[PDB]
């Protein structure tokens, strides 16, 4: 089935959006962004999120997370979430409200609680990230030990993320 674009959402005409994807109001999909739900797996991108050029959202055929609307989703992106250039969000995945995912970083089969800041060239996999935690650039997080010991978002680090998107 087709995707649902909120009329109040701005989706570049050169972006590629395939399948059961839910684009909320005020959501900005940049040029060359790839969102693909060709498994019959639902995708939901919450309001006023920003997907930058080259970002990409894939989903596994099997696996889901629980959305805030009580539905099961392959991918649930919350509200005000930044997914930056060349970053990947794959498979069963949950990003909270006000999450940041830096350049060329991957979130796959994982839970990222709200307000979290993920930097650049990083992988988060197989973990439930606590709300409000910061993964450094280049980090590889696969054990729930590693998650538990993540720094909380320094009021500094959310400035860096607020510079990366400046609109």
């Amino acid at each position: 089935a087709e995707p649902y674009i909120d009329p109040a959402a701005q989706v570049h005409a050169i972006a590629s959006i395939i399948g059961d994807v839910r684009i909320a109001a005020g959501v900005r999909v940049a040029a060359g962004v790839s969102i693909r739900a060709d498994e019959g797996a639902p995708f939901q991108v919450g309001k006023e999120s920003i997907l930058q050029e080259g970002a990409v959202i894939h989903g596994l055929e099997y696996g889901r997370v629980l959305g805030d609307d009580q539905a099961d989703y392959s991918v649930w992106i919350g509200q005000r979430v930044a997914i930056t250039h060349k970053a990947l969000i794959h498979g069963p995945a949950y990003l909270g409200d006000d999450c940041f995912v830096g350049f060329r970083s991957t979130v796959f089969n994982a839970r990222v609680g709200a307000g979290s800041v993920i930097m650049m060239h990083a992988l988060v996999q197989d973990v439930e990230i606590p709300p409000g935690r910061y993964v450094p650039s280049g980090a590889i997080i696969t054990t729930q030990q590693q998650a538990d010991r993540l720094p909380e978002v320094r009021p500094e680090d959310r400035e860096f993320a607020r510079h990366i998107i400046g609109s």
Binding site: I14, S16, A31, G32, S34, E53, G54, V56, H85, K86, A87, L88, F103, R104, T106, M120, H121, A122, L123, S137, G138, I140, F160, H163, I164, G166
Partner: protein, 121 residues
């Protein structure tokens, strides 16, 4: 994971064309792979010199100034340049290099997966 193996995969193109948005001025002997994204904000421009090659999946995004790829510089697939950057004459950038407000000496070579990021110049 082996080196760069944690980084995202490198996806095929959908068109045989790349996409520019902003102020770009291109050199007749330049080779740009399909699906490369040259983006320049209103305060900004991208400048690519003679003999440059830009590989599959690369993204050049100029912000607060200019990105200048000088002549004979080469970018492997998925190189990402955000901010303002000058890539030296004859430079070579490994796959999935990231340069953020950082420049490259002429002839300098970047290991694949490299991450070079300064806050602001």
């Amino acid at each position: 994971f082996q080196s760069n193996m944690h980084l995202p995969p490198l996806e095929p193109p959908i068109s045989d064309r790349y996409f520019a948005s902003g102020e770009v001025t291109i050199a007749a002997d330049v080779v740009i792979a399909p699906g490369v994204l040259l983006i320049a904000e209103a305060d900004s421009r991208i400048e690519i010199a003679s003999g440059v090659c830009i590989g599959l999946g690369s993204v050049i995004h100029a912000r607060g100034g200019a990105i200048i790829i000088q002549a004979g510089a080469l970018l492997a697939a998925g190189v990402l340049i955000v901010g303002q950057s000058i890539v030296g004459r004859q430079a070579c950038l490994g796959a999935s290099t990231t340069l953020v407000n950082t420049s490259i000496e002429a002839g300098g070579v970047t290991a694949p997966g490299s991450l070079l990021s300064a806050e602001t110049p």
